[PDB]
Amino acid sequence: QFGRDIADTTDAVRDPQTLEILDITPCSFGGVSVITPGTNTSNQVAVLYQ
């Protein structure tokens, strides 16, 4: 019916309406970081996605 992996997480699933199989990959998560100089110097910042 459905697959797993080493980390005990679901990776592949089979729909009932078709004999095909659909893979599962989680939505892209990631931390955010703020590149910045001193606020005495400038007010601008740069956004970095990890």
Ligand X SMILES: *[C@@H]1O[C@H](CO)[C@@H](O[C@@H]2O[C@H](CO)[C@@H](O)[C@H](O)[C@H]2NC(C)=O)[C@H](O)[C@H]1NC(C)=O
Residues binding ligand X (CB under 6 A) = 17-19
Give the amino acid at 32: V
Alpha carbons 48 and 50: distance in angstroms, whole number? 6
Distances (CA, A) of 23 to 12, 18, 30: 4, 14, 21
In the bound complex, what is the minimum distance in angstroms from residue 12's beta carbon to another protein?
18
Residues 2-31 that bind another protein (CB under 8 A): 6-9
Indicate the residue among 6 and 19 with the shorter CB distance to another protein. Answer: 6
Residues lying near another protein in the complex (CB under 8 A) are found at 6-9
